[PDB]
Every structure is written in structure tokens, then in C-alpha cells.
């Protein structure tokens, strides 16, 4: 207390001065001259369920951004039988530049991503573009639009300069699911007469005027981009008599923005929670016909955490706790509150290393290329609740879930990290491998 | 070991008020050039004078060591105006005339509250002129956002 | 803990945190010109009533103006479900005149189309609350409605209109009140006996500037990059039971256009952009014995069910050349706004943007129709073969067909939003381009 | 308040008879101040 | 913000309080003192102790300085609770202080009562009563040791400790006279109480032992102590008539710089009775009921604050033929004077007039030198004794100028003067300086 | 059954233009004012 302090009797009178800026008169920035065109790509290979197809993006414009994969499907059953089927159909999509994999997304990632990062009417509109949401009936035909979510598919700021890649081609490889719920299969039962999908891939191209087009064509460029890292693993399945726990190695690299994960029943796409005889939680739920072994497919997702299987979790780095152990509901509700601002469905979890993981601008990362032992430690809920008795579910406790929750045996762990896509002398690839 | 520090007074810069410079309103017109305005309530008995340390022109001595804080910001003196030893109309005569006070409180007479750089003119010579002890700044009651009248310390 | 992440530092961090440019742990602020905002009522010249044309003149109480809200007091001429955004329907149109020049003009249908495309989530709901009855109000109920105007200066402080700099020009607004408003003074074609006339008032939010800003406005010349709406109505090449009608509509537009927007509608029923059907919400009494497919469930006039939309596909031609490949109506209805707005557009409403982000003020790519001698919108309609009174016929239909009742959507409304320059000098203002 | 016809079919200047139960009024104001930290200590400017 | 928001709120008005600060409040500096110790030592009392007897003691030289003196008495109640009133105070009829054969001072039981009435207060007064009376509703035969502190100048402060050491050649004595009767102990009004016990007495003196340099200084240096003395004479009261207002001019045979005069009117029959008896709960034996009498007080409740029962209407002090101050009402002497000058509650019938700014203190603060006043007198006006004491309506509903018919029993007047003199000690001997 | 009064106090305010508001706010003022002194007392009772 022998330090110097200031009385500040009129510190603020002293610190004032003239205005710097006025709110009521905007200056708009003059931008470059460009145009946007939607161009169809040629897809090689037969499109159909279970098939692998691909497309090369044609050099029609200078830069590319948005990519939408169109699919045409017909319902194989009535309303309540499908769940985001166009999302399910695109089993995966791989982005290759110069022959090097830059990224790769999975149907489950699209479901996880959406569940975690989209929101409000955007999420609804998304659902409109991937599912039947107006109680459509068997045979109903719709064109679905599945937007891709690669770094260049989200912002013009990361438009991929095909013009700057004169020696390297850019391709998308797409795996179509062998089965799509409510379209060609009802659970495990094939739907006789189901149609094969029609597919079309659209790329929205940016046409640049001469000065900017030339700079892209001739100069080296470094684009800060986001990559998905992913692998599936067995879940330490919980049971009626026990709280299972599991030490999961996190085989990730690069400065990671966040980790995200879900547990699921691989039988039913998007099922991240247990089934129960409560409205929407199972096929026929709330009635005598309810079966807690089959979801109400049209209502597969839920916010009822009582049906989720994670009791608590922590992430360790180099074997040491990165943060204090928190409950599954923390990862499901709070992380998203703080970091995204949307609402995340039960069974979907997030842990961010970033202030704002939902944005493009770096805001703190965890560099797993500098971490020797990254481990996710999970504790599961006890599967003791009789799912066929609503009272058992709705009146339960924090540490328990449905007996049907033991069917959520698959675990998917995803991570998003920042790498650099470098382009020069007509060629390109990633700045870092690992 | 890291060497300890003393008062370390905080001084701002004088500002352009239109055709003249003067110290900002929460501050006083202290010294010159290197130390033009005091911000903190105490400052470095600036040596430059006439030469003489009082304290100087606008601050008065306090009973302390560390020259950096021996003068207190916001004072002046009786400053004879016309025929009477009155403080400026915007100044507050403490009442410490001189004779009834010790040296330190005798000097600290006018309490220049809210009027550290500018004051108003006085009806002293029958003409509403700049107080006898200050510089005649070109502003008037009609001029907006400049409530100060001919004055500077 | 957190330290274990910081220590994991290496080569891949350089592009994120090497030579830091900003810190996220410190907010930087800007000294803004002092101002105040005051709500002042303007008067209305002319008699307020249905079918009447009335107008105001904005006095110079403040220096700049932004938001304008028109208040209406309406009664319900029937029970809940009989009205649809009635205050929006009532304000048939508003014309913006400066110095006698027509600067812009909005239409009730535009307000509906605009909302359908650009408002969203709770902004949209709160908007609905200000123009309709959304709490199941009954006949005789009375409410004050607030219909904000959407002229360029009514959307952002940045374009506050400089009444201050317009010494010799008045700013006026002409408001046309619809001769009939559904569920207020008419029920379909029938008048409602005893219906009350509206009470109306126009409110303007004025900005009061300080001395310095005020001086600049008075002495400096100004220019604003502003928006205008171009609009014409066309007959729909009405489709039928046995055919897919098609139509080439000349796009009689000029100026740098941010986007086009359009819808098809039934002139009788405000906001009806889709076909009627015996499925819940799709017609008056839909889903039951009393259902009719000649009248909508007015309270549920809008829908996200495309099966009831009329348009099959569309393209825009510039001087006879395709501007982009032909895309399905569902592409304009769902994808365009996904990409460009981030909200959800109801069936029957379509958008095509020339801009990267048409929802913003900052220009981001435009089609200047002042340099396109002959632009055309080419539309293909669906076959009107589905029997609207048979829920299954509708819900189970195909991509290329719609309801037989879709032939009631005989009107086509095409809008274009563009950028012009409002110049102010010598106390007068007006547009730079015809 | 117990009759929907009266509740849902009424005008602007009226409310429920049960609205007299709303006897509390809460008024909030959010404002800007400065928090200062210096030499290991801190608190508000004013 | 917070406490700091007060510190920063500084302007011209504050210069007068905190500019160029001289002192603080957050750092106390104490003064270093000498090495000394204090001890309570019993004195030997010569003569026979009993009611009405005179006994005495020479203060032994068991220390260098003396201060506090407490006289212990053991008495037994001769009746039930309510029959006594400060009986150990009544018992010690008088105390005389003599040095070297010269009287320094002399106190009387009535002075102790008067002194208390004016100068002790609050719990000090209560604790005092606890040391001289039975205040817990004790019954007949109850035995208590009472402690009567003396109030001579050296019994008030160490500052005036009597330098017994500096009096190597002159004795210091205490003479004590015990009352012939003590109310509620050996007599009940005029009636002796058969079987009443005689008092047991012990005199304690607190002696200060000084260490060597300080002891030597007192032993060898001459000393002059500015000390107090009590002057006292009894006078007959111009007892008011029940028909009119008596008046009286009393010569005040006082000398020396006087701090104050004090006086009371009383009924010698009943110790401590300075007011009239009446049939109201606080003013007579059995008051408030059928058995009430207004000839005898409820002794345990002898005193009262109700001036309606007092006899002084008004008074002035005249010096050498000239009025000292304008005549003021008796209530002015009873309530205001001590309010202003002492700060306690003076009981009805007891009056004070100060010539001093702070008479309750020890530092001289203005005195009236009666040795320079050829003829000082006290001029009194009495209240009319017309109120029927046996009727509460009359006792309590009366006027400023009247009192009880039983107020005529207050026939004695005690006038005291407390003054300064100087006790000069040298060469082992010491007597108070001024003769008169 | 007498009713209690309803009370309201209205003050007529003067709004000055700019130059005067400034001078009034900053300059000292002096006014002669009027005051009412009042002493109530008993009247010598008038007599018949």
C-alpha cells in the first residue's frame, strides 16, 4: 500500500475531447466487381443407395463458395417415418484439392453440427430442405437440398480460388447411404418398390472482374480454414445395475476450436437419446401401441435430458484434468449457451476451447499436435428406468436414465481445427499435416 | 531487487481551444512545456518562476517531502483586484486571509473549484473585463460550448 | 487446468497468435456525437377510413429521422382465425415523396413478401403481434396495431433522413387504406355489417443532433446510398389440370438491383400465396367435414407446405441469355433464403439474390438493369391435377404437381430492390437517377 | 376474467378484474460507470 | 465510490478542519509514568466504637502518599425493608481531617448526602447507595458491611495525593463521630429499637509506595497543593407559614475562593429528608393507602424529585449589599444549575449555585472570593405551606408557589460552601496556607 | 358525510430562449422581495 494512487477528482473532465464518429450517416464501402452463378456439375458413377459417386468442380468461374447437393426422394411410408432423410442419405462427403484430402463430413456430422450450431428459423428451414415437415404421406416426392458446410461453403471470405489452382483439380467424393429411414428401409425392413434417388450437385461460382481475377490467378494465397477430425468408437455401455465409465483416447492434432460428440443407436439415424413411452419418445409413445425399441422417427430428436446417457465428463490433457468434471447437462446446455447461443438436443455434447466456436475468427484453440495424452473421460448414467412407464421416466433422478438407453452403444467424437490452405504457382494443399 | 518509486505525478497536455492554447478543465495551467497541466491533486513545486517556487501560479505548498507532491492543485492567492483583495468571482475565498493562518494554510486561499483553467469576467472596472490576475481569452456569453470568459492561468 | 492448453504451443499456433494484433480481453470504444431521440406524432390530412387515401407531412422538429410507425386501431369483424396480418393488409401502400419527387413506394403485399423473406424468429413473431391478433381474440375485440415502415431511412440510423439539410423540401407520406380488410370489415367477398372504421396516427422518431453535427449537416452537401422498391403486377399464366403453363415476364426494372422477389397470389385473400387444401391449416375448416377449398383458414393463410405452391421452376434471362441454370421453385423458396438471409420463407414466396447478403444495407453485388436492355423472368408452373378436397391426394403428391385450387393464384407480383443515390444540396433533395 | 367472451372479445382500455392483483411495480434502469483498477486495488470512479 | 467518495469531496470549508493537518486520531501516544504501587491498609481506631461515640485514628505511615479512604461499618437492620436510608452515611455523623494539629477540612453526614445529591450520578450513585444502604429488600436482622468513601480532596484524585512522606514531622489524623441514632438500625423515628446491635468499624487507607527517585523528590522538595475545603454552618430556616410566604436574609459566614454554594432545607428528625411528606406513593410512610401518614417518611424512599414538596420559591446571593444575580426560582437552583454545571439529577429540596464554570471538576474554573466580600448573604423566599398533604389531588394538582402543610417540618437549613485553599508542605511539616 | 378535498398545485414556468437561459444560469442575481410579517394577538376585549 505504498504504491501510487490517483484521487480522480475530475479525471473524466480532464479526459474528454471532441467527437470521433457520428452514428447517423453511414459510409458504404465500394466493393469489387463480381457476379454469382449457379452451375450444375457432372457426377460420375451411378447414384443410388449405397453407391459411391464423385464430381469434379468445373472451371467455370474464378472462385467457389456455396455447394448444394440436391436429392429427389419419395416417402416409403407415412408421416412420422422419416428423419432428415436427405441428410442421412449423404453418408459422407470428401473434399480433395490437388489429390489431398482437405476435409470430410459424415451424415452424423451434419446431424451433430446442425443439432449443435444451427438455430431458430435457420434450423427449421434446413429441416425443410432435408425432410418432410408438413405431414406428407407415402409416395410423396420432394427435392431436398443438402448444403455442404466446408469452410468455403460458409463464407465468401474463404472462397476457394479455383482460378489460382491451374494445375490442381478440386473434387468432391460422396457416399450415399445403403439405407435411408422411411425412404427405402423402415428400421431393418426394406421397403419394397422404393425408388432410387435422383442426384444433382450445384456449385455457386464467383465471377471476378479483371483486377481481382488477375491477382487471384497470379499471387500466392493463404486461406485460414476449418477441418473436421473424426472417428467412431465403442461406448462403455451403461446398464441397469451400473454406472459405466470410460477413458477414451482422443487421437486429434492441430489447433482445435472445439470437440463435439454424441452417443447414438447406429440402428436409427440421429437417435442420440433413449426411447420411452412418453410423447414423441418412441413409436406410438403415449398409447397402448408404444414400443420403446423403435423411435418415432419423425420425432427422433429431443431436449429431454432424462433420456441421455452421459452423467458427467472431463477432458484431460497430458493426463491432467483440463477443467473440473461437469455433468452431461453442462456439455449439452451450458457450453452451447455460452459459446453458440442456440439450443442443443439431448445426447449431443460440446466442449469448446474457443470463446466463439460458432464463428470463423479464431478465438482460442487447443493444439493437440503439442499434446501427448489427450483423453476424454466419460461417466454414464445408470440404465434403471422402465421406459414403458412414463412415471418412471418423468419422475426420475439426475443420475439415471431409461433401460432402453443401453442401445446407444456408438460414440462419435468430432473436432474442428484451424489449418491453412495454401495456393501458389497453380498448386496447393495444407500448410500442416499434423 | 527492483527500485521503489515515489509520487510520479500525472501531467496532461495543453489543448487547442481555437487561436490559443490552454490547459483542459479538470486540470490546472501548471508550469510550462514539459509539465503543462496537473492532473493529480498534487504536483512538483515547478522551479521556473518570475525564478521562484510559488507554487507556481495556481497551486500552493503543503507540509510534505517528495517535491513531486509539495504543491496542491486548485488554489491561487488573494490576487488584488482593483481596490480589494478578493478572489475572482468564480473562486471561493476560504477565509484564510494570511494573518490568521500558518504558512501552508495561509497560501491556500481561493479553492478554485470547477474553475481551474477558465473563470468569468468581473464587473470591476465598470467594463466587464478579464480579472486583473489572468490572461484575456477571447470568448463571450453568446459563444456556445465555451462558458469560460476572458481568463487563463 | 487452462495452463495445460497454453503450454501446448508451437508452429501451428503462429498463424493464430504469433505477433498478436488484437486482444479479446479489452474493449475499445468510440466517442460518438451526442444525440437524443424523441417520438413525435404527425397528423393526417384526409379522412381516415377504408378505401381512403390520406397523407402526412413530417415536420422539422428534429434534425434527422429514422423509424416511422403507423398506428391503427382495428376491431375484429369475426372470431379468431378470420384475420391475417390485418393492419398490414389495411395499409395498402405508402408512397414516399421528397420535394414532390417520388422516392419510393411500399405495398401491403410487399410488406408481406418482405416479412416472408427477411424477418425471422421472434422478430417475425413480434412483428405479427403488432399487425394481427395472435392470442385467439374474438369478434368485437379491439387492438392498436403498429405497422413500421420499411423505407431505407426506417431501417438504420445510418440512413437517417437529413430533414435538417432539406431547407426547401418537405418529406411526405401518402398512405392508402385498403377498401377491405379480411376479418375486420369484410369476410371473403361479404361486407361485415357494423364494422368500425380505423383510427390512424403516424409516428416519427426524430434525432436531435448536437451543435457540431448540426452545423455539418447544414453546411456540407450530402449523398446517401439508398434503397428503392420497383414493382409491377402481372397475370399468372395460370396452369391447369392437364398442363404445365409457362410464362416469359419482361422484367421492367432499372438501377443496380440487390435482389428480385416474387410471389403468386389469390387477389381475393391477402397473403395467400399457396393453393387451398383439406389438410390442417390449408383451408377454412381444413381437416374436417366443414372444410372448403375455396376459402383459406385466414389465421393460417401462410404455410411452409410447398405442395401447395404453384411454381415448378424458374430462371432469369438477361438480354435473352440465361443468367443461371433453371432451378426448381423449391430452390428459390428454400435455398436462396438459406444462403442469403438465414430465415425461413413460406411456400409461394420466391427470392433470387444478385447480392451475397441482400438482407444487409451494405451493397454486396448487384444486377444493374439499367445496362440490360431486356431482362426476363421465365416461369414454369406445376400441373394443377390434385384434388384439394382429398387430404391424401395432396399429402402424397409428386414434385411436378399441385392442387387444383392452385389455379386461383392468378396474380403474379414481381419486386426488385435496388440502389440509387439521394443527393442533398442547397436545401433541396432528390434522386440521382431516374 | 372467468368468461372468455369478455376476455378475448374486448377493447384497448380495459383489462381483467383480476388485474388488480398486480399490485407490485418493478422499475429497472441500466447505466454505464467505470471500474478502475490500479496498483493492485480497485472500485468505481464515482 | 464507497468511503473514498467522502475523502475526495474536499473544498474550502475543509481547509479549516483538515488542511495542513496537525494531529491524527489513529495513533495514540501515551505518557510514560513513574513506578509505584498501591495498597489497602487497615488503621487502628482509638476510642470505643458505638452509636454516639467519637473515635479516631492517626494515619500510619505505611506508604509515601495517601489517596482513597474508606470507612467500613457493620450494621444490622432494626426493622424490615424500607426503614433505612443510606444508614451508614447517617452513621458517620462527621469526619475531621487534621494535619499537624491544624484542621484542614471537616465533613458531616448531611454533606455526604448533599454532595451525593449534587455530584454523584447514574450507576456511580447507585453503586454508592449499595455501599451505604440495604437496597435489595433486606429484612430485619440483615447484616451488611457498608463502605463509606471519604470525599476529601486527596480522596478524589492521585493528583492531590497527600504527601504523607513529606510530612515526616507532622501527624495526619482522621476523627470520626458516629451518630447517636441511625434510622432503621437502632431507632425508628424517635423510638429506640430494642436489641439493636452496635456497629463494627474499620478504617482503610490506600497508601502509595513510590520508587526511589520519585520517593526522594516527595520526601525532600517543598510542595504546594491547591486543594478544596468545605465550609459549613447550620441555620434556622424561616419556616414558611401555611398562610403566606416567609422570607429570609442569611448571613453567609464564608471565606476563601468559593467554587460553589450548596444548600438544603431539611427535617432533622429524618436523615436525608429535604422535602415535605405527602400521601402520594413516593412521599410518606404508607403513602397511597389507608395507613398512610404524613408525619413519617417511607424511609427507604425518603428522597424525591417532585419539587412540589420542596420549600424554596426563589433565591439570590447578595455580595456586599449588591445582588450577584437576578432572583431565580427554587427549581432553577434544583434543576438548571446542576444541569449546566454537573450533569446529574439533583433531588428536590437540594439546591446549588455555582460561581465556577465547572464545579464538578478539580481544575479551578472561576471562584467567588468571599474573603474579599465584606458581607455576603443568601436571600430566600419560601413557598406557602397550604396544601393538604394527605390529599393527592391537592398534593399533585397544585401551583408553583405552594407546597405541603407538612413542609413546615423542614425547619433546618444547611448551607455549604466549597472553596480552594493551599496545602503547603516543607521541611517535614504542613498546614493549609490561608487562615481566612 | 362531508367529503375531503382534492388538491393539485400548478406552477407556471417560464422557458427562456438560449441567450437568456445561459445568463440566468451563470450570473448572480439580486431581487428585492416582499415578505409578510405577522403577529397574532388578543384584542383588548371590546366592552359594552
* Range E249-252 contact pairs with CB under 8 angstroms and sequence separation of 24 or more: E249/E318, E249/E377, E249/E378, E249/E379, E249/E380, E250/E377, E250/E378, E250/E379, E250/E380, E250/E413, E250/E415, E251/E375, E251/E376, E251/E377, E252/E317, E252/E370, E252/E376, E252/E377, E252/E378, E252/E415, E252/E417
Backbone conformation region of residue B52, classed left if phi is above 0, alpha if psi is from -120 to 50, else beta: left
Beta strands in C237-386 (DSSP E): 246-250, 256-265, 311-318, 321-322, 327-328, 349-353, 367-368, 375-381, 383-386
- Residue entry with cell 458517620: E92
CB proximity D43 to E under 8 Å: yes
DSSP 3-state percent helix, strand, coil across chain D (nearest 5): 20, 15, 60
E26-64 burial, b if ≥16 CB within 10 A, otherwise e? eeeeeeeeeebeeeeeebebeeebebebebbbebeeebb
Evaluate whether A347 touches A263 at the Cβ level (below 8 Å). yes
Q: Do residue C140 and residue D12 have CB atoms under 8 angstroms apart? A: no
CB proximity D15 to C under 8 Å: no
Q: Least CB-CB distance to B26: which of A2, A4, A10?
A: A10
**Measured between beta carbons, which residues in chain D are less than 8 angstroms from residue A5?**
38-39, 41
Interface size between A and C, measured as CB pairs under 8 A: 191
Residue A299 and residue E158: Cα distance in Å, rounded? 97
Burial bucket for residue C420 (CB in 10 Å: 0-12, 13-18, 19+): buried
Evaluate whether C276 touches C408 at the Cβ level (below 8 Å). yes
Q: How many CB atoms lie within 10 A of CB D24?
A: 5
CB proximity E20 to B under 8 Å: yes
Interface size between B and E, measured as CB pairs under 8 A: 29
CB proximity D44 to E under 8 Å: yes
Which three cell numbers mark A226? 476449418
CB proximity E4 to B under 8 Å: no
**Measured between beta carbons, which residues in chain D are less than 8 angstroms from residue C145?**
none
Instruction: Please report which helix (H) or strand (E) contains residue C416, including its range.
Output: strand C411-425
Burial bucket for residue C155 (CB in 10 Å: 0-12, 13-18, 19+): middle
Cα–Cα distances (Å) from C105 to A125, A222, A319, C417, in that order, read: 30, 46, 66, 11
| Alpha helix (H) residue ranges in C41-162 | 86-90, 108-118, 121-129
C113 phi, psi to nearest 5 deg: -65, -45
Residue C264 and residue C377: Cα distance in Å, rounded? 13
Helix C121-129 and helix A120-128, axial crossing angle in degrees, nearest 10: 100
What SS3 state is found at E374? coil
Interface of A with C in 297-356 (CB under 8 A): 317-318, 320-323, 353, 355
CB proximity C139 to D under 8 Å: yes
Q: What is the sign, positive or negative, of the torsion defined by CA atoms of C148, C149, C152, C158?
A: negative
Which three cell numbers mark A353? 476451447
Residue A370 and residue C6: Cα distance in Å, rounded? 10
CB proximity B41 to A under 8 Å: yes
Torsion on CA atoms A207, A208, A209, A211, rounded to nearest 10: -160
**Measured between beta carbons, which residues in chain C are less than 8 angstroms from residue A18?**
31, 212
B70-97 burial, b if ≥16 CB within 10 A, otherwise e? bbbbbbbbbbebeeeebbbbbbbebebe
CB proximity D4 to C under 8 Å: yes
What SS3 state is found at D21? helix
Neighbours of chain B (3+ CB pairs under 8 A): A, E, F
Strand partners, B12: B37
Burial bucket for residue E127 (CB in 10 Å: 0-12, 13-18, 19+): exposed
Residue C196 and residue C76: Cα distance in Å, rounded? 9
Q: Do residue A125 and residue C2 have CB atoms under 8 angstroms apart? A: no
Residue C405 and residue C293: Cα distance in Å, rounded? 7
CA distance C192 to chain A (A): 34
Residue E401 and residue E382: Cα distance in Å, rounded? 8
CA distance A1 to chain E (A): 15
Residue of E nearest to D42 (CA): E1
CA distance B92 to chain E (A): 7
Evaluate whether B60 touches B101 at the Cβ level (below 8 Å). no
A329: which residues sit within 8 A by CB, 6+ positions away? A305, A308
Interface of C with A in 345-404 (CB under 8 A): 345, 353-354, 356, 361-365, 367, 392, 395-399
Mutate to test the interface with A, among B12, B23, B24 (most CBs of A within 10 A): B24
- Residue entry with cell 403486377: C233
Residue C330 and residue C345: Cα distance in Å, rounded? 10
Q: Do residue A4 and residue D40 have CB atoms under 8 angstroms apart? A: no
Backbone conformation region of residue B116, classed left if phi is above 0, alpha if psi is from -120 to 50, else beta: alpha
DSSP 3-state percent helix, strand, coil across chain F (nearest 5): 20, 0, 80
Terminal alpha carbon distance of chain A: 50
**Measured between beta carbons, which residues in chain E are less than 8 angstroms from residue B94?**
12-13, 15-16
What SS3 state is found at C300? helix
Torsion on CA atoms A328, A330, A335, A338, rounded to nearest 10: 160
Which three cell numbers mark D43? 472500485
Residue A8 and residue D39: Cα distance in Å, rounded? 15
Residue B59 and residue B68: Cα distance in Å, rounded? 13
Cis? peptide before B56, omega within 30° of 0: yes
For residue E50, which of E198, E185, E195, E192 has the smallest C-alpha distance?
E198
Please report the DSSP string for C214-234 in residue order.
Answer: HHHHHHS-EEEEEEEEEEEEE
**Measured between beta carbons, which residues in chain A are less than 8 angstroms from residue D34?**
12
Torsion on CA atoms A329, A332, A334, A335, rounded to nearest 10: 130
Q: Do residue B120 and residue F26 have CB atoms under 8 angstroms apart? A: yes
In the Cβ-directed half-sphere of A115, how many Cα atoms lie within 13 Å?
A: 29
Residue C171 and residue C185: Cα distance in Å, rounded? 31
Please tell me what DSSP assigns to residue E30: -
CB proximity E8 to D under 8 Å: no
**Measured between beta carbons, which residues in chain D are less than 8 angstroms from residue E1?**
43-46
Neighbours of chain F (3+ CB pairs under 8 A): B
| Alpha helix (H) residue ranges in C293-423 | 329-330, 336-340, 391-395
Q: Least CB-CB distance to B10: which of A2, A6, A13?
A: A6
Please tell me what DSSP assigns to residue B86: P
In the Cβ-directed half-sphere of E16, how many Cα atoms lie within 13 Å?
A: 8
Evaluate whether C299 touches C80 at the Cβ level (below 8 Å). yes
In degrees, rounded to 5, the angle at the alpha carbon of residue E6 between the alpha carbons of residues E4 and E7 is 65
Mutate to test the interface with B, among E15, E16, E23 (most CBs of B within 10 A): E15
Chain length of chain A: 434
**Measured between beta carbons, which residues in chain C are less than 8 angstroms from residue A20?**
30-32
Please tell me what DSSP assigns to residue A342: S
Neighbours of chain A (3+ CB pairs under 8 A): B, C, D, E
Strand partners, A414: A230, A260
DSSP 3-state percent helix, strand, coil across chain A (nearest 5): 20, 35, 45
In degrees, rounded to 5, the angle at the alpha carbon of residue E239 between the alpha carbons of residues E234 and E242 is 165
C50 phi, psi to nearest 5 deg: -75, 135
Residue E79 and residue E75: Cα distance in Å, rounded? 12
CB proximity A72 to C under 8 Å: yes
For residue C304, which of C80, C120, C157, C131 has the smallest C-alpha distance?
C120
Residue of E nearest to B109 (CA): E12
Beta strands in C178-319 (DSSP E): 186-187, 190-191, 199-209, 222-235, 246-250, 256-265, 311-318
Q: Do residue E2 and residue D44 have CB atoms under 8 angstroms apart? A: yes
DSSP 3-state percent helix, strand, coil across chain C (nearest 5): 20, 35, 45
Q: Do residue B12 and residue A14 have CB atoms under 8 angstroms apart? A: yes
Please tell me what DSSP assigns to residue E300: G
| Alpha helix (H) residue ranges in C230-320 | none
What SS3 state is found at E108? strand
Evaluate whether C222 touches C385 at the Cβ level (below 8 Å). no
Terminal alpha carbon distance of chain E: 68
What resolution in Å is listed for this PDB structure?
3.5
Backbone conformation region of residue E268, classed left if phi is above 0, alpha if psi is from -120 to 50, else beta: alpha
E395 phi, psi to nearest 5 deg: -70, -45
Cis? peptide before B55, omega within 30° of 0: yes
Residue A105 and residue A174: Cα distance in Å, rounded? 10
Residue A232 and residue E61: Cα distance in Å, rounded? 106
CB proximity A7 to B under 8 Å: yes
Please tell me what DSSP assigns to residue E307: G
For residue E304, which of E276, E279, E268 has the smallest C-alpha distance?
E276
Strand partners, C42: C202
Instruction: Please report which helix (H) or strand (E) contains residue B107, including its range.
Output: helix B103-107
Q: Do residue B142 and residue F26 have CB atoms under 8 angstroms apart? A: no
Evaluate whether C354 touches C367 at the Cβ level (below 8 Å). yes
Evaluate whether E407 touches E289 at the Cβ level (below 8 Å). no
CA distance B24 to chain A (A): 6
Backbone conformation region of residue C323, classed left if phi is above 0, alpha if psi is from -120 to 50, else beta: alpha
**Measured between beta carbons, which residues in chain B are less than 8 angstroms from residue A10?**
25-27, 116
A191 phi, psi to nearest 5 deg: -100, 110
Backbone conformation region of residue A64, classed left if phi is above 0, alpha if psi is from -120 to 50, else beta: beta
Mind spelling out the 3-state secondary structure of B4-58? Answer: CCCCCCCEECCEECCCCEECCCCCECCCCCCCCEECCCEECCCCCCCCCCCCCCC
Amino acid at each position: 500500500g505504498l504504491s501510487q494512487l490517483v484521487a480522480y477528482g475530475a479525471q473524466d473532465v480532464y479526459l474528454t475531447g471532441n467527437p470521433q464518429i457520428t452514428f447517423f450517416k453511414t459510409v458504404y464501402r465500394r466493393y469489387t466487381n463480381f457476379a454469382i452463378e449457379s452451375i450444375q456439375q457432372t457426377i460420375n458413377g451411378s447414384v443410388g443407395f449405397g453407391n459411391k459417386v464423385s464430381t469434379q468442380i468445373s472451371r467455370n468461374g474464378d472462385l467457389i463458395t456455396d455447394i448444394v447437393v440436391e436429392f429427389v426422394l419419395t416417402k416409403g411410408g407415412n408421416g412420422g417415418t422419416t428423419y432428415y432423410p436427405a441428410e442421412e442419405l449423404l453418408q459422407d462427403v470428401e473434399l480433395e484439392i490437388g489429390g489431398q484430402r482437405i476435409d470430410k463430413h459424415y451424415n452424423d456430422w451434419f446431424r451433430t453440427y446442425d443439432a449443435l450450431f444451427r438455430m431458430n428459423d435457420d434450423r427449421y428451414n434446413y429441416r425443410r430442405m432435408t425432410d418432410w415437415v408438413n405431414n406428407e404421406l407415402v409416395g410423396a416426392q420432394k427435392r431436398f437440398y443438402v448444403p455442404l458446410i466446408f469452410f468455403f461453403n460458409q463464407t465468401p471470405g474463404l472462397a476457394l480460388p479455383l482460378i489460382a489452382l491451374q494445375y490442381h483439380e478440386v473434387k468432391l467424393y460422396f457416399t450415399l447411404a445403403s439405407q435411408v429411414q422411411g425412404v427405402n428401409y423402415n428400421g431393418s425392413s426394406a421397403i419394397a418398390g422404393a425408388a432410387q434417388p435422383t442426384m444433382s450437385v450445384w456449385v455457386d461460382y464467383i465471377f471476378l472482374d479483371t483486377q481481382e481475377r488477375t491477382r487471384f490467378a497470379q499471387l500466392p494465397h493463404e486461406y485460414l480454414i476449418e477441418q473436421l477430425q473424426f472417428t467412431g468408437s465403442e461406448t462403455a455401455t451403461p446398464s441397469a445395475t451400473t454406472q459405466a465409465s470410460q477413458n477414451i483416447r482422443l487421437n486429434f492434432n492441430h489447433p482445435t476450436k472445439y470437440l463435439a460428440w454424441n452417443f447414438n443407436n447406429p440402428t436409427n439415424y440421429g437417435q442420440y437419446t433413449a426411447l420411452a413411452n412418453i410423447p414423441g419418445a418412441c413409436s406410438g409413445a403415449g398409447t397402448a401401441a408404444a414400443t420403446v425399441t423403435t423411435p418415432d422417427y419423425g420425432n427422433t430428436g429431443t431436449y429431454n435430458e432424462q433420456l441421455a446417457v452421459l452423467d458427467s465428463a472431463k477432458i484431460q490433457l497430458n493426463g491432467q484434468d483440463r477443467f473440473a468434471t461437469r455433468k452431461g447437462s453442462y456439455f449439452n446446455k451450458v457450453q452451447p449457451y455460452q459459446s453458440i447461443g442456440g439450443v442443443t438436443p439431448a445426447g449431443v455434447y460440446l466442449y469448446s476451447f474457443a470463446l466463439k466456436p460458432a464463428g470463423r475468427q479464431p478465438s482460442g484453440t487447443c493444439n493437440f499436435s503439442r499434446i501427448d495424452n489427450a483423453t476424454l473421460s466419460l461417466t454414464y448414467k445408470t440404465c434403471s428406468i422402465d421406459a414403458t412407464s412414463p412415471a418412471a421416466v418423468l419422475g426420475n433422478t439426475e443420475t439415471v436414465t431409461a433401460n432402453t438407453a443401453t442401445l446407444l452403444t456408438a460414440l462419435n467424437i468430432y473436432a474442428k481445427n484451424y489449418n491453412v490452405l495454401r495456393i501458389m504457382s497453380g498448386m496447393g494443399g495444407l500448410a500442416y499435416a499434423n | 531487487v527492483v527500485k521503489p518509486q515515489g509520487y510520479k505525478p500525472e501531467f496532461v497536455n495543453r489543448v487547442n481551444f481555437g487561436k490559443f492554447w490552454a490547459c483542459p478543465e479538470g486540470t490546472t495551467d501548471w508550469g510550462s512545456e514539459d509539465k503543462q497541466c496537473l492532473v493529480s491533486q498534487y504536483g512538483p513545486m515547478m522551479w521556473r518562476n518570475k525564478w521562484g517556487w510559488s507554487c507556481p501560479a495556481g497551486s500552493a505548498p503543503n507540509n510534505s517531502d517528495d517535491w513531486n507532491q509539495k504543491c496542491v492543485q486548485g488554489y491561487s492567492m488573494k490576487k488584488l483586484i482593483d481596490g480589494q483583495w478578493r478572489c475572482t468571482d468564480t473562486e471561493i475565498d476560504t477565509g484564510k486571509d494570511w494573518s490568521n493562518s500558518d504558512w501552508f494554510t495561509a497560501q491556500q486561499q481561493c479553492d478554485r473549484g470547477n474553475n481551474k483553467v477558465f473563470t468569468r469576467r468581473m464587473y470591476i472596472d465598470g467594463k466587464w473585463q478579464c480579472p486583473d490576475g489572468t490572461w484575456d481569452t477571447g470568448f463571450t456569453w453568446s459563444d456556445g460550448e465555451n462558458g469560460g470568459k476572458q481568463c487563463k492561468y
